[PDB]
């Protein structure tokens, strides 16, 4: 129920399902963006995953244990979004990040535009390590999208 990999986050009531996001299972912990689950518990098969750590400002939440993803964008190299869009199989998109310049420093950012339910898809370095999650971003003047490469702290 916690096998390593990328997962869709789905909701259903009485009718069909909706994909609200995506996340990463690593080292027994499930990692997604806070806005996907709002910190609610997750079903995994017959099991229940409870939120362990989260932070609204970083827009991140981990389940079953503390945040495990610690790889960082090197500030130089191309990256891959492993996009898991609603209704489509996972696909890798390579890009050279831009930069969100903030008063607290620079954050890598990817100019790649996918449906809202792609939120939580992992962004990878060339070793396949997850350097952050896709889906907290901004809309620029022409209506296109730029996502921060959002990474947590592994304590």
């Amino acid at each position: 129920e916690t096998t390593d990999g990328v997962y869709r986050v789905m909701t259903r009531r009485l009718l069909g399902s909706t994909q609200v996001g995506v996340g990463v299972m690593q080292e027994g912990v499930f990692h997604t963006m806070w806005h996907v689950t709002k910190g609610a518990a997750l079903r995994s098969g017959e099991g229940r995953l409870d939120p362990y750590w989260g932070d609204v400002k970083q827009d991140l939440v981990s389940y079953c244990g503390p945040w495990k993803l610690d790889a960082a964008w090197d500030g130089l190299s191309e990256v891959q979004l492993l996009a898991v869009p609603p209704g489509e199989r996972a696909k890798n998109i390579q890009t050279l990040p831009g930069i969100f310049k903030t008063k607290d420093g620079d954050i890598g950012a990817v100019a790649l535009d996918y449906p809202a339910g792609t939120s939580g898809s992992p962004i990878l370095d060339k070793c396949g390590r997850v350097i952050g999650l896709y889906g907290n971003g901004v809309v620029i003047k022409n209506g296109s999208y730029v996502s921060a490469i959002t990474q947590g702290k592994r304590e």
């Binding site: 997750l42 969100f100 971003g137 901004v138």
Partner: protein, 41 residues
């Protein structure tokens, strides 16, 4: 209540010889205490 659940969707693997794309924008942004980014204009 709403059934929020997960389902496996793949292995996490860098793809060699991948489609490379998108630009590299240099944006001035602010981050508020609700986790929302906005453009500084």
């Amino acid at each position: 209540s709403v059934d929020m659940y997960i389902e496996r969707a793949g292995d996490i693997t860098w793809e060699k010889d991948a489609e490379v794309t998108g630009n590299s924008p240099r944006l001035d942004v602010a981050l508020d205490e609700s986790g929302d980014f906005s453009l500084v204009e």
